[PDB]
Design a protein around this ligand. Structure first.
Ligand SMILES: *[C@@H]1O[C@H](CO)[C@@H](O[C@@H]2O[C@H](CO)[C@@H](O[C@@H]3O[C@H](CO)[C@@H](O)[C@H](O[C@H]4O[C@H](CO)[C@@H](O)[C@H](O)[C@@H]4O)[C@@H]3O)[C@H](O)[C@H]2NC(C)=O)[C@H](O)[C@H]1NC(C)=O
Ligand SMILES: *[C@@H]1O[C@H](CO)[C@@H](O[C@@H]2O[C@H](CO)[C@@H](O[C@@H]3O[C@H](CO)[C@@H](O)[C@H](O[C@H]4O[C@H](CO)[C@@H](O)[C@H](O)[C@@H]4O)[C@@H]3O)[C@H](O)[C@H]2NC(C)=O)[C@H](O)[C@H]1NC(C)=O
Ligand SMILES: *[C@@H]1O[C@H](CO)[C@@H](O[C@@H]2O[C@H](CO)[C@@H](O[C@@H]3O[C@H](CO)[C@@H](O)[C@H](O)[C@@H]3O)[C@H](O)[C@H]2NC(C)=O)[C@H](O)[C@H]1NC(C)=O
Ligand SMILES: *[C@@H]1O[C@H](CO)[C@@H](O[C@@H]2O[C@H](CO)[C@@H](O[C@@H]3O[C@H](CO)[C@@H](O)[C@H](O)[C@@H]3O)[C@H](O)[C@H]2NC(C)=O)[C@H](O)[C@H]1NC(C)=O
Ligand SMILES: *[C@@H]1O[C@H](CO[C@@H]2O[C@@H](C)[C@@H](O)[C@@H](O)[C@@H]2O)[C@@H](O[C@@H]2O[C@H](CO)[C@@H](O)[C@H](O)[C@H]2NC(C)=O)[C@H](O)[C@H]1NC(C)=O
Ligand SMILES: *[C@@H]1O[C@H](CO[C@@H]2O[C@@H](C)[C@@H](O)[C@@H](O)[C@@H]2O)[C@@H](O[C@@H]2O[C@H](CO)[C@@H](O)[C@H](O)[C@H]2NC(C)=O)[C@H](O)[C@H]1NC(C)=O
Ligand SMILES: C#CC[C@H](NC(=O)N[C@@H](CCCCNC(=O)c1ccc(I)cc1)C(=O)O)C(=O)O
Ligand SMILES: C#CC[C@H](NC(=O)N[C@@H](CCCCNC(=O)c1ccc(I)cc1)C(=O)O)C(=O)O
Ligand SMILES: *[C@@H]1O[C@H](CO)[C@@H](O[C@@H]2O[C@H](CO)[C@@H](O)[C@H](O)[C@H]2NC(C)=O)[C@H](O)[C@H]1NC(C)=O
Ligand SMILES: *[C@@H]1O[C@H](CO)[C@@H](O[C@@H]2O[C@H](CO)[C@@H](O)[C@H](O)[C@H]2NC(C)=O)[C@H](O)[C@H]1NC(C)=O
Ligand SMILES: *[C@@H]1O[C@H](CO[C@@H]2O[C@@H](C)[C@@H](O)[C@@H](O)[C@@H]2O)[C@@H](O)[C@H](O)[C@H]1NC(C)=O
Ligand SMILES: *[C@@H]1O[C@H](CO[C@@H]2O[C@@H](C)[C@@H](O)[C@@H](O)[C@@H]2O)[C@@H](O)[C@H](O)[C@H]1NC(C)=O
Ligand SMILES: *[C@@H]1O[C@H](CO)[C@@H](O)[C@H](O)[C@H]1NC(C)=O
Ligand SMILES: *[C@@H]1O[C@H](CO)[C@@H](O)[C@H](O)[C@H]1NC(C)=O
Ligand SMILES: *[C@@H]1O[C@H](CO)[C@@H](O)[C@H](O)[C@H]1NC(C)=O
Ligand SMILES: *[C@@H]1O[C@H](CO)[C@@H](O)[C@H](O)[C@H]1NC(C)=O
Ligand SMILES: [Ca+2]
Ligand SMILES: [Ca+2]
Ligand SMILES: [Cl-]
Ligand SMILES: [Cl-]
Ligand SMILES: [Zn+2]
Ligand SMILES: [Zn+2]
Ligand SMILES: [Zn+2]
Ligand SMILES: [Zn+2]
Lengths: 694, 694
């Protein structure tokens, strides 16, 4: 038989291990020769594995790199202009590498150049609420200051945007051991913690779903018209640089001005965490000086695109994609995911060589330049948007397969909740103590739904990975799954060695997954999802699950508004239309499900499969959200305060945010009412796509 | 048999005549009770005729009406403030009506209120080139003046926008007998010419495809959020009023200042056609004063939507739509079209009662408020955009069936050229001298293609009727056909009695089509198109015809650019990408046609029907054209100088227009290059939708 069990049984932990080792021996930074060579290797291998076609799709996009002969660093400088302390020029390389070349030193990609010098202000995680605390409550003015902020809690580009709007002239980002050093485990190479010399790389775009900053809307092909840098999309306006906690200690230890407002502002270093501005009495005349000389440069990137043609519905596409570019060795991010994709392709190819084909076409993608802001996936989706929006069934992402070894983590559209529940009930748990139990059982026990007994948590999609263009711009049902830790307050901060030189094969093999059993479980979940999406006669989407969450999201946004009862009275702010639309969606979805259960007629089947496929698409507003033309989904968008998190009813949520501070309450509440009308209309219009067609 | 010949044979001239009489006895102005009563009648009749469902879809949209107790008029006023001449308060009603009530007096819908008084400037047709002639060559400044312009050549809203940008404080529009009085025919009621007291009504929106000015993007339903008037879309900022040629003579006869620059500025009245400003010596102290008191008001409108469910592909929609609202009696516009739609519905219903159903679903629409800027069709398409863009095969418009009795006129997407040619070869010509000949033969003889021997002229779609939202916003293949005159310089001016009280049943029955044979021919063309679109196994679209025109349009836009060879050198302006894309489209379309001719497999059939259906959709850019978010088609848009005309490669055409006058040539040519890249990309992306799908 060629069924799902045959596909899953062909997946082997030992192959994933061999692939991970193969992918992590040298750096594969986007736009470098090494990354192009790996692209060519994967292309050759996917062909050998049995795919019908495997092509490279290249684009010329804005990337950012340090200047090799003019290194970035930060100084404490004295009254005379003597630099009395300098931050490190590189991370101490891990054992046995120390002679690898082309390790990019830590830098914040897309930082502009500059040498600002000023007094420090410490801003905690530099979240919206941290700046509210500083400016509104503590009356500390960040204008003309260099801010220092710890990594964690929110996407670093949000920190940078927040600091810019506060008037900062530069940002220093650092990893505090509170966030990146788990108590009782050793620093790399003797455990999985971050050492004091480790540094987290990463782009600091003000992400708006655009892709390449120079070509919003259109693929960065050979004849593309490019914006000038000043008009580029998403680029920060102040210099930024990341540092490790040994260096941060030296910058923070002299800080004066005000005490931290409370304990949530204190990390684990032996410093006061004073907010500043500037240093205590004796050192009041010293300043901090940044030296940033990175350059933005248009550079060629390469996606590998493999096709396994469908036997029955070749014009329906199920996509499994994940990126290949890494900051350095990519031991977890992304190669633990890419190794899983490679073994999935190998398994589907084995079935194909035996004469099987999936019902629908499967596309496999190895994306480039994800680390520089999702550039490869976004340019390819821009190029192929017409094909994808009329033919795209689903997108399953495959970045890092593991960020811990505790339990499963899943973010997906409500249309895939039932599929995920059903698939995990048929997979074996890899967890100690759950031998012979299902993955659904272990997952549900370890990560309970906050709403439902006996169900697991599944979160909302935002940005931060390559599914963004497919889901938030194009409205293709999307999902992601990986193995994760037990560390809730840290779910957006990254594992300790995230984007550091210490993310190696040895890190994974020694400390995360020596048997590759968690990798294998993740391959079964991602591959099983793709198998079911590509082979089920009726698409495995349950519209009733969307109706359940829409009511949840409507109750939640109403509750936010109801913090302002006098204004809702004054401006006649009613959510009645939105609750009506959700009620109608619930009723229509129930009737559609009955018909779906109740119909030999392939036209009715496909007509109903098209209704299922286009249901996610119906939540797209072609006008986009306010000032966010590429975030078009009306139910979900990346949070405006944290691009990693998804926000529900984002147009209403942003209209309501901090509304009590707006100077023209009439105008502000008018815009809330406008967003309620757009949301109610969109939910009703999506419901109507499930009605009888004529 | 139930085939096309059965459908066509059931159509009867005598029924169209009876329906036209029934629809034109009383005014059916949008938003009035009489128009709602007619909507209910049509709904009842379409049900009786055999449609599966017939519903009213209502919206509350901004309309405009004169004030019944404060009439609009224009005066010549003397030094003292005595109004020594007043224009007419109403058109003399036609014989036998003179006691009809609720005839709306002539007015320009959406004019703001005001009583500006000033000196006149005469601006010919108030086209872009007429204002270029005035300001640039004649050095006449229109600022603070009242302009007087003759109707004709371009949409009146373009005249008004042009006058506003010239600084005019008001506009008077009039019908010159040069344009509205054919030599040798009598004025109504003794012939089809405009009398001196006749006046052309019409909206003066600055049309941008938005629909209701208060709700751009979203349907004007019960909970809709409305823009304030100041932010409304498309509204003119200066008062405007139309008048007949008896009144115009009185305003023009005293005009002084400069002589007309040449004979193309002179109409047929016995006046000098001096351009002004102001009156000759003796009357220099007299002024012109407007009195406009019309009011914009949100008013309910009603579309009738009838459904004939498809037997095989009920989720594919072929739409026949035309409007029902009229300015007064609507003898030609729209009821000559609506009578044709009524008989088409009756004929399809006859087949249905005998057990037949079309392969695909046919939707029939009687739209409201077309005369106020396409409001009913546009709000309904906004409401149902998700259904239409995933299911819409084609839209056939059905406004006025006749504007003359000479030959056929057709505007449609290249995808329907072959269908139109083939259908007209099987229809009988109704023309004297062509008894026993095909309609294709008479049409081709009377209206030859400028490009091809033995082929007829088919023009491009712009705006000005209810197909606009379907084609220019949503990218649904669209067409229109009617009988027309032999009067080429007048093809955008309207027949003489256009939008006047004299457009009656008697006008049509006595002077245009006593036998209703031209109406019957038009019913055969429109109905035959709908029949073939709804019943052909393979959709009757030929992608190769798009490839032919794309090359034509590329040669034409290149030729415009090549008027500026030094700039193309300086700014490296290359059309190479666009010609490459067109060449690729040609090659791919040829290969797709071969496959289409070469495949019992309904999945391949429907897969290929979906490729045909989505090909028009592929020319849509979700970002819209510059500052025109609702004109999304990259190959066609309504001309920015004449909304009635279509423009090809409109983004490049507008970037190039008057470019030699732009102050920053670098920026201007950069935007030309940007538009070439968008067009080349869109053509290539559309071509790729015709490639093998996997
Ligand atoms: C959820 O689906 C329900 C259908 O089950 C749908 O109900 C619709 O609600 C609208 C708006 O409430 C109804 O609109 C009414 O239509 C009638 C004619 O059918 C009109 O006469 C009404 O207008 C009068 O009353 C208004 C309200 O007081 C006045 O403002 C107005 O000036 C008139 O006096 C009104 O337009 C519509 O009939 C139903 N459709 C049904 C029951 O089939 C509801 O809209 C859906 N929810 C959403 C968010 O779409
Ligand atoms: C019409 O369809 C044709 C295919 O039949 C398609 O041709 C494609 O053209 C592009 C752009 O001209 C080619 O791009 C090249 O790709 C190779 C690798 O395959 C690259 O090495 C090339 O880059 C080098 O050369 C450039 C030009 O001098 C330099 O700017 C660059 O820095 C490099 O040195 C270049 O990217 C592509 O290979 C073909 N594809 C084929 C032949 O299959 C054409 O693009 C289509 N027209 C449109 C408007 O889409
Ligand atoms: C996840 O698994 C559940 C449990 O198997 C699936 O739900 C089950 O789906 C089947 C097939 O539609 C349902 O069977 C139908 O039952 C009705 C009788 O009510 C009958 O008319 C049909 O002929 C058919 O036998 C079954 O009721 C249903 N069970 C439950 C509890 O809902 C679910 O579809 C799977 N989700 C996926 C594939 O996305
Ligand atoms: C308009 O009418 C023309 C003339 O009938 C139609 O073109 C004709 O279409 C038929 C059916 O596709 C073609 O027949 C095919 O011929 C090839 C041999 O070359 C064969 O492989 C197929 O089995 C089939 O018989 C025919 O060649 C073609 N004639 C011409 C001159 O093109 C055209 O399709 C009609 N347009 C519509 C319906 O939109
Ligand atoms: C901190 O570094 C500065 C600058 O050093 C230069 O750039 C670094 C990235 C590194 O590559 C060095 O080798 C470079 O010389 C030091 O200040 C410089 O000191 C030298 C020698 O005394 C002097 O000639 C330069 O002008 C100085 N450059 C300045 C002030 O910009 C500084 O000594 C270092 N401080 C410490 C405590 O190590
Ligand atoms: C031109 O008309 C004006 C205004 O007349 C009024 O409004 C018209 C629409 C119409 O409905 C008339 O019946 C209205 O009286 C005339 O000027 C008015 O004349 C009357 C009587 O002499 C005087 O009391 C008003 O104040 C005038 N109103 C003005 C100047 O605004 C004027 O006489 C008419 N001119 C001609 C040549 O007929
Ligand atoms: C944008 C971008 C590029 C680059 N993207 C990432 O590094 N993404 C990483 C971010 C890890 C830290 C935050 N974690 C999450 O956002 C997350 C992780 C897993 C799941 I299932 C759901 C959400 C990832 O998605 O694994 C960056 O953030 O610098
Ligand atoms: C917009 C709007 C409302 C209203 N629309 C119309 O009156 N449309 C009329 C305009 C008749 C005068 C110009 N004629 C054309 O644009 C035309 C007519 C037929 C064909 I086939 C192709 C183009 C119509 O399309 O028949 C108006 O123009 O005032
Ligand atoms: C990763 O695995 C690939 C595939 O086996 C290795 O690339 C092959 O190397 C051998 C020996 O040099 C060559 O004969 C083949 O042509 C290569 N095959 C390809 C590129 O498809 C590669 O050497 C391995 N990399 C590491 C670091 O182990
Ligand atoms: C237009 O035709 C319609 C349909 O025949 C006429 O409306 C009918 O009028 C009769 C007599 O008053 C009534 O019994 C019916 O109820 C009406 N039917 C409908 C509305 O479906 C209408 O009278 C005609 N109008 C004119 C001006 O002749
Ligand atoms: C990168 O840096 C190169 C070397 O810069 C020189 O050496 C450093 C240590 C400084 O002293 C600096 O002032 C010197 O100019 C540059 O020559 C080169 O332009 C830069 N590369 C870029 C901008 O891409
Ligand atoms: C419409 O006009 C009504 C009557 O206006 C009055 O009579 C005319 C002849 C003028 O003399 C005018 O100045 C008078 O006020 C108004 O009462 C009514 O407001 C208007 N209707 C509207 C604006 O919808
Ligand atoms: C903060 O700092 C700068 C001082 O240069 C000033 O321009 C700005 O207005 C200040 N804002 C507040 C709120 O104090
Ligand atoms: C793997 O799981 C064990 C047992 O719970 C834990 O002690 C170990 O640190 C985990 N590894 C990682 C990287 O979390
Ligand atoms: C036209 O007229 C007004 C006079 O009030 C003036 O402001 C405007 O600048 C003039 N423009 C030209 C080009 O003469
Ligand atoms: C109808 O055709 C005849 C003969 O060519 C012509 O004289 C007559 O005026 C036409 N009617 C109209 C309205 O064009
Ligand atoms: Ca781009
Ligand atoms: Ca609207
Ligand atoms: Cl992932
Ligand atoms: Cl028409
Ligand atoms: Zn990653
Ligand atoms: Zn990463
Ligand atoms: Zn009309
Ligand atoms: Zn009209």
């Amino acid at each position: 038989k060629h069924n799902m069990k045959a596909f899953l049984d062909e997946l082997k932990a030992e192959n994933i291990k061999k692939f991970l080792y193969n992918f992590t021996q040298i750096p594969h930074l986007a736009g470098t020769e090494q990354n192009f060579q790996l692209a060519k290797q994967i292309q050759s291998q996917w062909k050998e594995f049995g795919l019908d076609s495997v092509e490279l799709a290249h684009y010329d996009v804005l990337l950012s790199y340090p200047n090799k002969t003019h290194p970035n660093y930060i100084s404490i400088i004295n009254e005379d202009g003597n630099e009395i302390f300098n931050t490190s020029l590189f991370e101490p390389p891990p054992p046995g590498y120390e002679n690898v070349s082309d390790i990019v030193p830590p830098f914040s990609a897309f930082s502009p150049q500059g040498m600002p010098e000023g007094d420090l202000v410490y801003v905690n995680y530099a979240r919206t609420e941290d700046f509210f605390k500083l400016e509104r409550d503590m009356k500390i003015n960040c204008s003309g200051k260099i801010v220092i902020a710890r990594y964690g809690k929110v996407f670093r580009g949000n920190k940078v945007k927040n600091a810019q709007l506060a008037g900062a002239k530069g940002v220093i980002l650092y990893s505090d051991p509170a966030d990146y050093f788990a108590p009782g485990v050793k620093s790399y190479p003797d455990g999985w913690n971050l050492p004091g010399g480790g540094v987290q790389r990463g782009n600091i775009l003000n992400l708006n779903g655009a892709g390449d900053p120079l070509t919003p809307g259109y693929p960065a092909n050979e004849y593309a018209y490019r914006r000038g840098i000043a008009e580029a999309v998403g680029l920060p306006s102040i210099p930024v640089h990341p540092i490790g906690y040994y260096d941060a200690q030296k910058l923070l230890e002299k800080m004066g001005g005000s005490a931290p407002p409370d304990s949530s502002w204190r990390g684990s270093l032996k410093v006061p965490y004073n907010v500043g501005p500037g240093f205590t009495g004796n050192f009041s005349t010293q300043k901090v000086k940044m030296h940033i000389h990175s350059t933005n440069e248009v550079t060629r990137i390469y996606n590998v695109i493999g096709t396994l043609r469908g036997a029955v519905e070749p014009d329906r596409y199920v996509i499994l994609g994940g990126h290949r570019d890494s900051w350095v060795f990519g031991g977890i991010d992304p190669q633990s995911g890419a190794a899983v994709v490679h073994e999935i392709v190998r398994s589907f190819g084995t079935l194909k060589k035996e004469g099987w084909r999936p019902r629908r076409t499967i596309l496999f993608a190895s994306w480039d330049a994800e680390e520089f802001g999702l550039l490869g996936s976004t340019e390819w989706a821009e190029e192929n948007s017409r094909l994808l929006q009329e033919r795209g069934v689903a997108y399953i992402n495959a970045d890092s397969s593991i960020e811990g070894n505790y339990t499963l983590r899943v973010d997906c559209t409500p249309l895939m909740y039932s599929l995920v529940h059903n698939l995990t009930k048929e997979l074996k748990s890899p967890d100690e103590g759950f031998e012979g139990k299902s993955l659904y059982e272990s997952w549900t026990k370890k990560s309970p739904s906050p709403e439902f007994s006996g169900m697991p948590r599944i979160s909302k999609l935002g940005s931060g990975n390559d599914f963004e263009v497919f889901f938030q711009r194009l409205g293709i049902a999307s999902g992601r799954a990986r193995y994760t830790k037990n560390w809730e307050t840290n779910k957006f901060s990254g594992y300790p060695l995230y984007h550091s030189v210490y993310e190696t094969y040895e890190l994974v093999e020694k400390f995360y997954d020596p048997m590759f059993k968690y990798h294998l479980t993740v391959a079964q979940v991602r591959g099983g999802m793709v198998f079911e999406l590509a082979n089920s006669i009726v698409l495995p989407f349950d519209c009733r699950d969307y109706a359940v969450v829409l009511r949840k999201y409507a109750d939640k946004i109403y509750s936010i508004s109801m913090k302002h009862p006098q204004e809702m009275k004054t401006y006649s702010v009613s959510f009645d239309s939105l609750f009506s639309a959700v009620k109608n969606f619930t009723e229509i979805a129930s009737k559609f499900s009955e018909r779906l259960q109740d119909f030999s007629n392939p036209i009715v089947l496909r007509m109903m499969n098209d209704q299922l496929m286009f249901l996610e698409r119906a939540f797209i507003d072609p006008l986009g959200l306010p000032d966010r033309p590429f975030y078009r989904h009306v139910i979900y968008a990346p949070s405006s305060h944290n691009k990693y998190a998804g926000e529900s009813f984002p147009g209403i949520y942003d209209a309501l945010f901090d509304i009590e501070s707006k100077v023209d309450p009439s105008k502000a509440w008018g815009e809330v009412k406008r967003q309620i009308y757009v949301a109610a209309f969109t939910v009703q219009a999506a419901a109507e796509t499930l009605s009888e067609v004529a």
